Amino acid sequence: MSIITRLFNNSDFEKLNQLCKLYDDLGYPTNENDLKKRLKKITNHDDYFLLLLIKENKIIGLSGMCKMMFYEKNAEYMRILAFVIHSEFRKKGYGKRLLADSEEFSKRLNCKAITLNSGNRNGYVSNTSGFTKQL
Amino acid sequence: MSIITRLFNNSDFEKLNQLCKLYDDLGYPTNENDLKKRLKKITNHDDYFLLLLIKENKIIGLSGMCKMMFYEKNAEYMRILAFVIHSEFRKKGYGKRLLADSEEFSKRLNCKAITLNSGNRNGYVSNTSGFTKQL
Numbered sequence: 363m364s365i366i367t368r369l370f371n372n373s374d375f376e377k378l379n380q381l382c383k384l385y386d387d388l389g390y391p392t393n394e395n396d397l398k399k400r401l402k403k404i405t406n407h408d409d410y411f412l413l414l415l416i417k418e419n420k421i422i423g424l425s426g427m428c429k430m431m432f433y434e435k436n437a438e439y440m441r442i443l444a445f446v447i448h449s450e451f452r453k454k455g456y457g458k459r460l461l462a463d464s465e466e467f468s469k470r471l472n473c474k475a476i477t478l479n480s481g482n483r484n485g486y487v488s489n490t491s492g493f494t495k496q497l
Numbered sequence: 498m499s500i501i502t503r504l505f506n507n508s509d510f511e512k513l514n515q516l517c518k519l520y521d522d523l524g525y526p527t528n529e530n531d532l533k534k535r536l537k538k539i540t541n542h543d544d545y546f547l548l549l550l551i552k553e554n555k556i557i558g559l560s561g562m563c564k565m566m567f568y569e570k571n572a573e574y575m576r577i578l579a580f581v582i583h584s585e586f587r588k589k590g591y592g593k594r595l596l597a598d599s600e601e602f603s604k605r606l607n608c609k610a611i612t613l614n615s616g617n618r619n620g621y622v623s624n625t626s627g628f629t630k631q632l
Contacts, residue, residue: 388569400570403571428565434579436534443567465632475632477629478628478629479625481624482625488627488628489616489617489618490615490616490629492613492624494610494622494625496609496610497603497609497611
């Protein structure tokens with residue numbers, strides 16, 4: 363109360379304008395039709411977890427995650443794949459809150475670690491560089 | 498012929514010493530019992546693809562991958578999670594060959610891109626930094 367985090371649920375297909383607004387802030391604007399299709403696919407996958415930051419019923423942040431297996435040990439970790447706070451809600455600790463809740467959520471799912479990649483243009487260690495090739 | 502890449506298959510549970518040797522080169526030595534359990538779990542997941550480099554029946558490299566959905570567009574990409582060439586087979590283009598085959602494999606699965614993180618201690622762009630927190 364009254365800022366909560368909760369997982370995406372099917373009622374959230376009635377809130378696509380709010381989600382579109384966040385994807386725009388993320389730098390990937392879209393439309394409600396395509397977003398509906400995409401989120402339907404993502405949220406029906408057992409390994410993907412879309413965690414939402416809610417303020418007075420409005421979605422004001424999202425943390426899109428996937429739970430992964432290590433190839434090198436028998437354990438699991440979480441990867442944060444998308445993270446955004448609404449452009450009008452910045453510098454008020456919501457980013458900190460949504461990240462902390464993402465970690466807590468991951469820990470409950472027995473993840474040994476949480477990881478993410480961020481662009482170049484709290485206890486997190488940066489010891490890898492990302493390399494991407496378009497195919 | 499006679500260097501091939503192929504996916505891991507169940508006959509490869511008879512070659513765990515070869516796989517253990519690669520995990521050691523990877524920096525994560527293990528034993529055959531635990532490795533059997535781990536690879537059983539990983540290879541029974543529809544999204545994970547363990548591609549092997551084979552030379553005269555011997556496993557001399559591995560590329561462990563997972564196929565992922567973008568949160569921000571309706572498409573997929575591949576992540577390379579583990580990549581190693583046998584310590585006695587270095588500087589002979591096997592790394593190049595196994596990477597090229599990983600990309601080709603990914604492209605056939607309709608991946609738009611292939612990505613990986615590498616430590617700090619060919620057409621790939623490096624525009625992200627990795628951040629990891631232990632939980």
